[PDB]
Amino acid sequence: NPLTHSTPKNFGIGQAVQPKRNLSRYVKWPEYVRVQRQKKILSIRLKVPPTIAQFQYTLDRNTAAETFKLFNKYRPETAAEKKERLTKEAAAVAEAKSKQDASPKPYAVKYGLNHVVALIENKKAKLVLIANDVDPIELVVFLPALCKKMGVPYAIVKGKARLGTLVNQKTSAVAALTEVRAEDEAALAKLVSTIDANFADKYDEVKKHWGGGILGNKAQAKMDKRAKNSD
Amino acid sequence: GRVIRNQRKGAGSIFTSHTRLRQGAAKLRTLDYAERHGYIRGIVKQIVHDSGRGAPLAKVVFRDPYKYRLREEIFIANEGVHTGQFIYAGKKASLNVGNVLPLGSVPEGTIVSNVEEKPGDRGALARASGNYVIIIGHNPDENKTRVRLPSGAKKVISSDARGVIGVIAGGGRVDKPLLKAGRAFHKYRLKRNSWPKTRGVAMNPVDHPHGGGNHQHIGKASTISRGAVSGQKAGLIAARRTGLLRGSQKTQ
Amino acid sequence: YATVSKTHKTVSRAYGGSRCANCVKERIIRAFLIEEQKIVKKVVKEQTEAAK
Amino acid sequence: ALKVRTSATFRLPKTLKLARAPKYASKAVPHYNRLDSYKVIEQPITSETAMKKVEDGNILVFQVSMKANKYQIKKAVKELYEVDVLKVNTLVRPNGTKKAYVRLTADYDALDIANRIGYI
RNA sequence: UUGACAUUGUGAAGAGACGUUUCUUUACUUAUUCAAUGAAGCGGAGCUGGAAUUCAUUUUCCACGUUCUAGCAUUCAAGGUCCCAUUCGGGGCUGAUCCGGGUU
RNA sequence: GCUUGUGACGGCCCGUGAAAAUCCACAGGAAGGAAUAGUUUUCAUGCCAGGUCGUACUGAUAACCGCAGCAGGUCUCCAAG
RNA sequence: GAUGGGGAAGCUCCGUUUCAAAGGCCUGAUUUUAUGCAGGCCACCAUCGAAAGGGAAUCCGGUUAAGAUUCCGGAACCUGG
Numbered sequence A: 001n002p003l004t005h006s007t008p009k010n011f012g013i014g015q016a017v018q019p020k021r022n023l024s025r026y027v028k029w030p031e032y033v034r035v036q037r038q039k040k041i042l043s044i045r046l047k048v049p050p051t052i053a054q055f056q057y058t059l060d061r062n063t064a065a066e067t068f069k070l071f072n073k074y075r076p077e078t079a080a081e082k083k084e085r086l087t088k089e090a091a092a093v094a095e096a097k098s099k100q101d102a103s104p105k106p107y108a109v110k111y112g113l114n115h116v117v118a119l120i121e122n123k124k125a126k127l128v129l130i131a132n133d134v135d136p137i138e139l140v141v142f143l144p145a146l147c148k149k150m151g152v153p154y155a156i157v158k159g160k161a162r163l164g165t166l167v168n169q170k171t172s173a174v175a176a177l178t179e180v181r182a183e184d185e186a187a188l189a190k191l192v193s194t195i196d197a198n199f200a201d202k203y204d205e206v207k208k209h210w211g212g213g214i215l216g217n218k219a220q221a222k223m224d225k226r227a228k229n230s231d
Numbered sequence B: 001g002r003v004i005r006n007q008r009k010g011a012g013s014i015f016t017s018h019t020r021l022r023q024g025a026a027k028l029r030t031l032d033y034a035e036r037h038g039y040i041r042g043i044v045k046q047i048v049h050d051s052g053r054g055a056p057l058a059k060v061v062f063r064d065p066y067k068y069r070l071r072e073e074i075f076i077a078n079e080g081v082h083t084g085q086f087i088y089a090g091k092k093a094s095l096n097v098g099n100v101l102p103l104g105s106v107p108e109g110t111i112v113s114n115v116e117e118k119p120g121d122r123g124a125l126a127r128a129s130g131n132y133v134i135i136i137g138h139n140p141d142e143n144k145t146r147v148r149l150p151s152g153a154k155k156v157i158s159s160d161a162r163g164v165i166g167v168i169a170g171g172g173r174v175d176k177p178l179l180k181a182g183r184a185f186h187k188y189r190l191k192r193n194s195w196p197k198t199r200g201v202a203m204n205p206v207d208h209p210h211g212g213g214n215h216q217h218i219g220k221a222s223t224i225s226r227g228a229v230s231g232q233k234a235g236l237i238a239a240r241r242t243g244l245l246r247g248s249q250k251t252q
Numbered sequence C: 001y002a003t004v005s006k007t008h009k010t011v012s013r014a015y016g017g018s019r020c021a022n023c024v025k026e027r028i029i030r031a032f033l034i035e036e037q038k039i040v041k042k043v044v045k046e047q048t049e050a051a052k
Numbered sequence D: 001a002l003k004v005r006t007s008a009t010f011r012l013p014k015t016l017k018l019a020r021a022p023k024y025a026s027k028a029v030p031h032y033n034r035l036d037s038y039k040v041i042e043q044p045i046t047s048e049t050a051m052k053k054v055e056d057g058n059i060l061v062f063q064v065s066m067k068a069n070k071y072q073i074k075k076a077v078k079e080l081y082e083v084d085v086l087k088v089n090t091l092v093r094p095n096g097t098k099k100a101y102v103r104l105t106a107d108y109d110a111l112d113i114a115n116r117i118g119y120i
Numbered sequence E: 001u002u003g004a005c006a007u008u009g010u011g012a013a014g015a016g017a018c019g020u021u022u023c024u025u026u027a028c029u030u031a032u033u034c035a036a037u038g039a040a041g042c043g044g045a046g047c048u049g050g051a052a053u054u055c056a057u058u059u060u061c062c063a064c065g066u067u068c069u070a071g072c073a074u075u076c077a078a079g080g081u082c083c084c085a086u087u088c089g090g091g092g093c094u095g096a097u098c099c100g101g102g103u104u
Numbered sequence F: 001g002c003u004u005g006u007g008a009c010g011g012c013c014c015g016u017g018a019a020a021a022u023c024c025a026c027a028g029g030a031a032g033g034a035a036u037a038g039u040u041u042u043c044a045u046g047c048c049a050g051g052u053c054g055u056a057c058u059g060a061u062a063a064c065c066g067c068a069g070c071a072g073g074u075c076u077c078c079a080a081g
Numbered sequence G: 001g002a003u004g005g006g007g008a009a010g011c012u013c014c015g016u017u018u019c020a021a022a023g024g025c026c027u028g029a030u031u032u033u034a035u036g037c038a039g040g041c042c043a044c045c046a047u048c049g050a051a052a053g054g055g056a057a058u059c060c061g062g063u064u065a066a067g068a069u070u071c072c073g074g075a076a077c078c079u080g081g
Helices: A031-044 A061-074 A079-093 A113-121 A143-150 A185-196 A217-228 B033-037 B181-189 C022-051 D070-081 D110-117
Strands: A128-131 A154-157 B041-048 B057-063 B070-076 B086-088 B100-102 B111-113 B133-139 B144-148 B154-158 B162-165 D041-044 D059-064 D085-092 D098-104
Touching: A061 A154, A061 A185, A113 A143, A128 A143, A143 A154, B041 B070, B111 B162, D041 D070, D059 D070, D059 D110, D070 D085, D070 D098, D070 D110, D098 D110
Parallel strands: A128 A154
Antiparallel strands: B041 B057, B041 B086, B057 B070, B100 B162, B111 B133, B133 B144, B144 B154, D041 D059, D059 D098, D085 D098
C-alpha cells in the first residue's frame, strides 16, 4: 500500500537479466539417458516387420485386471508353505504309505519359458500371457505363432514385471495356467472369449501389417503444413 | 635422398606459430537468441594491436542476457569504428558501419567484413587488413545470398550468415616497401619460422628436386602435377598457365 | 595494502578507489540526463501513439 | 508431473557415501611410538668447541635423530632433563648426522646440567 | 586417383529392363558425416489487436517490450491475488498463454 | 664530473614489446544491530606460534670441462688518482 | 603429462576439456548432537615445469682456528592463531 511500488520488468531482448525459466526440454542428459530415449525413437522410425509389430498390442486395463484377478487365485506355494508341506509329506509318507501322497494335487499358474513352451506344444495350456516388453525380443517373437499353430489362446499382456508378482519374483516373461479349479472354469471361457477376439483370431490380419513410420514431431508438422497451406 | 623442407613443416615442431603476445582469437559473438531475433548493444572499450596481425582488434563488451555479468568479445576493428561507439548486433540491427547483421538483412551492394561461412561459425571471410566482401544479390530459395569475395570468386552462403558492416581496418599495409631484411625479419618473428628462404636450386640433390648442380637450374619442367607425391611437390603446382600476363580484373 | 588502514585505500565519495571525481561527476550527469530523457522518450511516443 | 529444472546442466546426483566399517582390521598390533625421546636425542656432542658453547653460551649440543624436527627436540630435551628451552637451532652435520644447538632459559645453567648428565 | 561390393534405409517424376522390378535428374531422417553451445528459448497453436473479403464467415493477411549520450540493470521480482490466524517468517497462482520433451 | 637509480618528455616499428598465484578497492545491500545500554578487533595497546631441506670452500694460468696443478673453454655484480 | 575416452597384435599411440552423471564452499536447522540435514549461488577446471621471471616480512654493531643478513647484543617487521 502506497509505500510499496509497482516496478515491472522488461524481460524482452536487450534488457533486464532474463529470469529463471524451465529448461527441462534442453538439459544435456547423461549419455545413458539419450541412448535409451533414442533407441525408442530409432525403432519408431524404420518400418518394423509385422512379427514385431505383433506386440505394442498390449491389453486394455479392464480385461487385464480381469485376467490378473483370476491369475492371482493360483499363486504358487510360498517358501513357508512348501516348508511345512515337506515336513508334512516326508515326516509321514516316508513313515507310512502313499508315495508322498499326503497332500492335495496342487493348482499353480505355471511359469518359466522352457516350461511354458513345451506346455504349448503338448497342448496342455488353456490360456497364456506373454509380456510385450521382453528383450531380447527373440525370446518370445514366435510365441504368438506357436499358440495360433497349436490352437492355444494367447494374449500379449503389458508387464513382464507384472507377471513377476504373479509368481513372486522380479520378472517372469510368460505365465500360463493349465488345470484350474472347477468353480473358476466359468471366467476362463469368458476371458478367452474376449481375448481370442483381440489376438489369436486377428493374428492373420496383424501378420500382414508392418509398423513404424512417424516422422517425429517437428518434421510431421513440416509435412502437415506442406499439405495444409500448400493444398 | 633427404626429407625435403616443405615436408618438415607438417610435424609442427620448429615450424608452429608464435602466439605468446596474441590477444584472443578474433570471433563474432556466439549466435544467441538476441542476435537471432532482435539485436543487442555493446560498446567498444578499446581498439588494440594484435601481434602478427596488422589490422587491429576491437574489444567490444556486451551484457549477458542470462546472468548479471559483463561479457567481452574480441572483434577485428573495422575502420571508422572508435572507442565508445555502440555496436548493435542482430537481425533487427541497423545498417551502420561497425554493426553486425545476417547477410539476408542487408540490401544488394552492402560491403561487409568478417562474414561467416556457415551461420554461427563466428567468422571466416575477409579478415585481413583492408578487406571486405560485397553483397551482389539474394535468393529466397532457402535463405541464400550471393557474395563476391576478396580473392574474386563469388560464393553463395546462407542469409543467416552474419557479416559485419564495413571494411577491416589496416589500410594499405602492403603499400610500404619493406626495405631492409631486418623489417622482414621482425615481421615473421611474430608469426612463424618461414623466413629467410633458401632456393631449392641452391641446395644439393638430397635436399630438393632442384638441388642438383654444376650449373644452377631446375633441369625439368618446374610445373608439377597435382597428383604428384608429397616429396615431389615443389614449384608451381597444378599450374594452369605460367609466365607474365598483366591481366587487369578477375572472374565476374 | 592488507597491512594498511582503509583511509589509505579510499577517498570519501562514490567509487572511493575505483573511479576519479571527474569520472564520477560525468558518471552522474550522464545518468541523470538519460533517465530524464527516458521519460521524455516514452511520453513523446505516447503522444504520437494517441495520434493514430 | 514433470519437475522444473532451471539449468540445462545435469550433475552427478549426490549419493550417500558410506563409511568404512571393516571386519578384520589392517594391522594386528599398532606400532609403538617410533621416534620417542630416547630415540630423538641420541648423544651429547662434546667437541672442545661445543664445550665452549656450554661454558659460555648456555647451549646444550646434542646429536639428534635425523628423522626429528625442532619441535620434537625441544620436547625431548625438556622431558629427559627437566629443563626449559628458548629456541632450538639445527644443522645437518656433513657426516650425515643431525646436530642440535639448544640454548636453555636463564633459570637453568647448561654447564651444571652438563656435568649433571655426566660429561664436561 | 578411378570403378565395384559391403556400411545402405524409406517417397516419388521420367527414360527404360519383361502392377512387381533394375537404370538418371530428387523429396524424406533415423544410419553415417560437420559445427556450436555452461545443450535457452526450437517446432506447432493461441491472448491482444489494425486492415481485408463477403454482397457477410472466418477465407486470410499484418503487427505484438531495446538506437541522440563511453551511466544503471544481480538477492526465487516489485505489483496483484490466494492460503498458515499469520508474532516473523514462509509458500502457492499470476507477473512471464498453451502444447510436443527433437539442445540447436 | 663517474657509476647507478629515478622522473617528466621525445624518436622508432607491416616489431607496439609474458602469464599466473597473490593483495586491495569500489558497486551491491543481504543481514545484524542501542538507551540502562550494545555496535564495532581495516584505530592504539596487549598474548602465543612460526616446521622441513640447502648454508663450509674454490669458481679458475691449480678446487669446473678439456686423460693433468694443461698458454684452450666456461654465465654475472662491485670499480679510486 | 595422469583421467571418461578413441587408436594399436602389443610394448603403447592419440586427446587435456578433450562427444564424461567429473565438485566444495558459506551456513542455518537441530540445541537427540558440533551435526545428519535444510536454504543455496559458484565452477567446460588433474598435476609437473623458473635457486636469473612473479613473490608476505631484518637491520646495525660485536664475535670464530674455520659459521654467520643464520650465533651474541640491541633494535624491528610479516604471517597465522
